[PDB]
Every structure is written in C-alpha cells, then in structure tokens.
C-alpha cells in the first residue's frame, strides 16, 4: 500500500509540497491531469482539517497518507491520513529553517521560468526549421513530401 | 489569368520540375495536399501526350499552361496547355546540360536528406527538453502547469 | 557584502557555501575564482568545525563578510561566525535538514538528465551549423565564413 | 589523377561554380581557406583568359583543369587548363537554358540565407541553454563543474 509523505513543510506551501511529491511518486503510472485533480481533492481536505487544528501561515506541518492507483485513478483511504502540527512558538528554530526552505524554492522558481523561456524560444526555432526543410523539399527537390 | 511555365527541363525529371514550380507560384494561397494532387493530375495528362509525341527520356521539353484558383482549389483549362519538344540528337549540346543539371539536382537531394535527418533529430530534443521542463515544474515548483 | 548559509546539515555545508557564493557574486567574479575562494574558506571551516566536535548529522549556521577586490574574493576571517546545533538537542530540526539533503541530492539527478539533453542539443546544433555552411560552399555563390 | 570540371555554366556564374566544384571534389582533403584562396587564384587566371576569348556575360563556358593535393595545398597544372566557349547566337537555345539555371540557383540562395538565420538563432539558444544548465549546477547542486 503506497504512501505519500511530505515531511517537514511550512504550512504556507504545504499544498504545493503534497502535489510536488504526488507527481514524483506516481510518475509514469498516471496522467498528469489525474495527479492535479487528486492532489487538489486531498489538499482541500487537509486545509479544512488544518483549520480545525488552528494552524497559522508560519507554522510547520507534516503529512502522511496512503493511496492506491486503480485503473488510472488515485484513491486514498482518508482515514490512513495523519497530520502532525508544530506551532512556530514552540519550535522557533525549525520554523525559521522552514521559511528558508520556502524562500529558496521561490528563488528556484525564477530559474525555471528562465529555462522555460529558452526551451520555448527553441521549440519555436525547431518548428520553423523543420517546417522550412519541408518547404525546400517541395520547391527544390522531387523527394517524398509530407502530404 | 496567371500561368505556370517550366523552362528547359530534361524529360527524365519533367514530373518533378512541374511540381517544384507549382508550389512556388502558389505559396500561402493553396494547400500542399491540393497542390500535390493537381501536380500529379496535370503531369499524367502530359504523360499521355508525351508517349503520343514519341519522346524519349534523354530529351528536353518546355511546358506552359494557364491556371486559376477557385476557393483554394486548383483549376486549369487544358486547351491552354502547350508542350514544346526537343530531340536529343538534334541539340546534342543542349541535352547534355539538362543531364548535368539533373545529376547535381539529385546530388542535392542527398544533402537535403541529411538536413532532414538533422532537423528531426533536433525536433526530438526540442520536445524532450520542453517536456522535461514541465516535469521539473511539476516536481519542484508551485508554478502553474500545462495540466491544471 | 555578506554570505550567510542559514540552517544546513553539516554534511552538505560545503556545498551550501559555494552554492550561495555563486549566487551572491554572479557576474562580478569569474567562476574559477568562486570555487577557489569557496574551497579556501570551506577548509577553514572544516578545521574550525572539528575543534568544536561536530558530527555529520548536526546542523550549522555560517556567516562571513567578504569583499570583491580587483576580481578576487577576500574575507576577513574575524567577521566569520559559526552556530552549531547537536542532533541530540534539535532532533526535530536535524531531521528536517536531512530531509532537505535527500531532496537536494534527488534534484542533482534531474539536472544531470537536463545537461544530458542540452549536450545532445549543442551537438546537434554544431552539426547543423556545420552542415548549413557546407551547403553554402557547394550550392551557392554566397559569402562563406572563411573569406 | 584528380580533374576539376564545371560542365555547362553561364559566363556570369563560372566564378562560383568552379569554387563550388572545388569544395565538393576536395571534401575533407583541404581546409576551406586553402580552397577559397586556390579557387580565387585560378578564377582570376581564367578571367584573364576569358577576356582574351572575348566572352560576353550571356555566353556559356565549360572548364576542365588538372590539380594535385600537396601537403594540404591545391596546386594545378595551369597548362592543363582547357576552356570552351559558346556564344549566345550560336546556341541560342542553350544560352537561355543556362540563364534559367542561373536565376534558379539565385532563387535558391535566398532560402539557404533564411536557413542560415535559423541555424544561427538556434546555435545561440543552445549556448544560452547549455550555460543556464551550468549556472544551475553551481547554484543549486553540489555536482562537478566546468570550473574544477
């Protein structure tokens, strides 16, 4: 029985961290659309639960839950889910450390956005090239076309 | 009334040349599907007129037809077609040129072949890379995804 | 100018310093100087860290001022200051940090994958440029790149 | 014995064609700089000779030369140099044909020019990407770097 776990994650972006782990865990087994929908459903549950524990933005949480993959759907036995909670005030040291993790992932996101912009510029060139190579075949040769 | 004319071309690769020229005079107005179809249709009509002339494959020929574009479609009155014939033995000098032409044009194809090989081999990476970026986005960021 | 690492497990403290050094200096110094300066201080730490008897599992905080001077990195060691946290004390913290390490190393594998592709690409590009030229030489009266 | 020959080529184009044929013939045997100098050297020699013959722009020529590769240089027996000329009024039919092959090859170049623009633009992204990858290595990982 496979198991999602987030480990120590600042509440601020617990939502992200479960999904991130969900993609990682189910890679290849399920379609991405399902991964988002599934994590979305759980994330909405752990939110209302987190409020019942009176959790603030700054606190650090922890998440364990079991799920099974069945004909390309992610189903979890919700009662196999457990949340641990850590008030910043109690574990001030850990709680800071977790803002540091957060900020260094926000920093990261800028880098990816850069990369995305390049890979985009590239598939663009790639298309324009491959497109043109054909346009030559047409006008300058008698080779087999793509028609 | 626009028109296609081929220019001096060896009988050997007459079929190719007419298709080459057609794309040219019709870029961005027609579709390749409609062009490749009409270029096969009109060159069959030439071929039956071509055996009718008794013209060999070492010879040289001039082709000029009128044509018209109708809602993306390609249409031509055939009694506008005009084929000139030039026997090898008569212009032994001319025919030798269209043979050297044809050879280098084929020699060119082999280079295009490698280019296509390169273009695709790239477009693979282009796609693998862009897809890896998504895979990163999903696993390592809170960024919006192709998926959502 | 001040590099600080914040909470990092003792094991990958080496990396963290350099990683951040690159970040802070980007553009201002050649990379060769970043590795040299980083390694120089990283040793100075390692030694000064053993004197305090720090295992690999413990967590640490490191702050040192430095100066960019005619393209070189100089730091006054006096400004350097190290906090040290025993796993025994912060069992909760030290886990979180180990958790980061695992994740950071999991990440390395993705990068390697990406490089693998960028390389395969640079190669393909170099070939295409190389071939495009060879076309110009054989089929055009165009100007070449050796005239 | 290696032997560069152009075949039928309009007077205007001779210059290129020989250089093109020299590259194609001596592939991987000599550095391009040598080829372009060598073609450069012969091409001026054949120009002088081409004026003596009184050849106009429109006429067609054929060229043959013997040459040998020595230590990475291209040397030719210049007395092996053999030219033929075909004034337009004599082969009026051939001259027009070689004119069309000229204008065609020029319509071609505008394409290679475009392709080149793309190849470059690409090479650039390759460089930018491949660099971005290194920056990630140094900033986000403890992997081995190009700087160790």
């Amino acid at each position: 029985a496979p198991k999602l776990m987030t480990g120590f994650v600042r509440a601020s972006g617990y939502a992200n961290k479960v999904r991130r782990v969900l993609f990682a865990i189910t890679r290849g087994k399920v379609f991405p659309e399902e991964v988002v929908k599934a994590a979305g459903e759980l994330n909405k549950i752990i939110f209302e639960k987190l409020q019942e524990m009176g959790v603030k933005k700054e606190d650090v949480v922890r998440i364990s839950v079991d799920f099974n993959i069945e004909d390309g759907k992610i189903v979890w036995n919700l009662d196999s889910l457990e949340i641990e909670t850590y008030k910043k005030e109690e574990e001030e040291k850990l709680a800071l450390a977790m803002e540091e993790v957060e900020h260094m992932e926000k920093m990261f996101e800028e880098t990816v956005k850069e990369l995305e912009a390049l890979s985009d510029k590239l598939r663009e060139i790639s298309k324009e090239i491959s497109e043109l190579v054909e346009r030559m075949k047409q006008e300058y040769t008698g080779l087999k076309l793509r028609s």
Side-chain angles (χ1 to χ4, degrees), chain A:
Chain A
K3 157 184 283 268
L4 177 165
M5 353 174 218
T6 62
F8 292 127
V9 41
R10 157 179 247 249
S12 92
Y14 83 85
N16 279 334
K17 180 71 183 204
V18 335
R19 199 227 267 149
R20 303 207 358 247
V21 157
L22 219 276
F23 270 107
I25 279 305
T26 77
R27 182 147 291 329
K29 310 258 161 281
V30 219
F31 276 37
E33 275 83 359
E34 182 66 29
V35 183
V36 20
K37 178 176 141 208
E41 279 165 9
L42 202 183
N43 270 347
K44 217 204 264 197
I45 266 80
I46 40 192
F47 184 87
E48 209 139 39
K49 263 270 223 296
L50 268 183
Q51 285 300 128
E52 284 160 29
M53 281 161 268
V55 153
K56 301 229 150 177
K57 204 161 49 55
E58 313 103 14
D59 298 341
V60 170
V61 310
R62 210 168 207 287
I63 305 184
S64 304
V65 29
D66 287 41
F67 66 107
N68 268 67
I69 350 83
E70 295 179 70
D71 273 311
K73 275 204 171 189
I74 305 166
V75 311
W76 6 54
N77 207 6
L78 300 150
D79 47 25
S80 55
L81 144 63
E82 353 152 30
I83 298 169
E84 263 92 70
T85 210
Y86 304 84
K87 213 81 159 70
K88 167 176 141 202
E89 304 141 73
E90 271 108 79
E91 316 280 281
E92 200 81 8
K93 291 184 207 283
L94 181 156
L96 147 53
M98 225 67 340
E99 295 175 10
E100 295 181 334
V101 174
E102 223 61 27
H103 177 273
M104 195 224 75
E105 302 192 66
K106 298 300 144 205
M107 224 57 193
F108 186 177
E109 294 183 12
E110 290 310 295
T111 278
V112 160
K113 280 157 100 273
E114 289 186 47
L115 182 53
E116 164 147 63
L118 270 320
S119 110
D120 277 4
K121 280 175 155 210
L122 156 138
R123 193 198 34 190
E124 174 49 48
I125 270 49
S126 191
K127 280 178 185 152
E128 286 191 63
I129 284 179
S130 290
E131 204 268 301
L132 187 104
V133 182
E134 190 64 14
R135 262 213 223 100
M136 289 185 82
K137 290 222 308 251
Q138 298 178 349
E139 312 191 49
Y140 297 121
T141 48
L143 289 181
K144 258 60 187 147
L145 270 69
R146 295 285 151 266
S147 183

